[PDB]
Design goal:
2 copies of one chain form a homodimer.
Chain A lengths: L2 E9 L4 E7 L5 E9 L2 E9 L8 E8 L3 E2 L3 E3 L9 E8 L3 E5 L5 E5 L6 E9 L1 E8 L1
Antiparallel strand pairs in A: 1-11, 2-8, 2-12, 3-4, 3-11, 4-5, 5-6, 5-7, 8-9, 9-10
A molecule of 2 linked components (GLC-GAL) binds next to strand 4 and strand 5 of chain B.
PDB class: sugar binding protein
Keywords: beta-sandwich, thermostability, mutant
Assembly: dimeric
């Protein structure tokens, strides 16, 4: 099953740090911040091999009973199958601020202008090993 | 719904710190470490008013399809309705080590000799505000 933190509000001014390990033969895994598996304000997918996507980050939002919105992509990809990663996320009402394992950063709009989220989860071909949400 | 951290293994040598706030008119709330809502290796219930229990901690394990085992109790109760609390838990194969908001400690046996747990949750009349599991 997926790894999740539920109903511990991730609020404006708080920081989320997750650590994990990428599966050896991973296709892709995602880190998700939102309200449900069908309501995601910040989805960050890490694509080792997905169709034609290789070594790319793909970010988007998922709206309940509606679907995926406009994707954003980054070629920053400091991730290795079989290896640990760590990611830090903070946000204000306009922006999600993501910091990757190597210190590079990606930003993604806070499309709903949410000030808090009740669900953080990892899905796909990786596992989590630690979390700080505070 | 309950507040939980799921499928981020809480392993030997790691520490769990949760912060939260007790509901104003709370009867009781618990912090639980185990595998499911029916499989709990360390249940720590905080009883403000429960039957004849007032201002007491009650610790126990819950076995799946079996039920609650031998309760242990403590009168250490540095908790106030409406107020923040923080708790830190670590364990080895014999013992759960719990540290309360005021620095006092309670210990509870690791009855299964588990070296890792996939579920941490809070239930009842309180809410969580932060977590460090690392
Ligand atoms: O946008 C995030 C989601 O992408 C979906 O895949 C897209 C893909 O990125 C796009 O290039 C085209 O292939 O449409 C696909 C289907 O919407 C993932 O399938 C999805 O899980 C999210 O990662
Ligand atoms: O042992 C933890 C569980 O206690 C249950 O309550 C017990 C109670 O502590 C005991 O004094 C007697 O009243 O039996 C009750 C029922 O088993 C709680 O109901 C339960 O949720 C756990 O906290």
């Amino acid at each position: 099953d997926r790894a999740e933190v539920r109903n511990i509000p991730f609020k404006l001014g708080m920081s989320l740090t997750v650590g994990g390990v990428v599966n050896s033969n991973a296709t892709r895994f995602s880190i998700n911040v939102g309200e449900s598996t069908d309501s995601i304000a910040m989805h960050m997918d890490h694509r080792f091999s997905y169709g034609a996507d290789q070594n790319v980050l793909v970010l988007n939002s998922l709206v309940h009973n509606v679907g995926w919105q406009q994707e954003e992509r980054s070629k920053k990809f400091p991730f290795t199958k079989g290896d640990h990663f760590q990611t830090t996320i903070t946000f204000d009402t306009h922006t999600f601020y993501i910091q990757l394992s190597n210190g590079e950063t990606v930003e993604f709009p806070n499309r709903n202008k949410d000030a808090a989220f009740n669900l953080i989860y990892l899905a796909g071909d990786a596992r989590l090993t630690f979390v700080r949400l505070e």
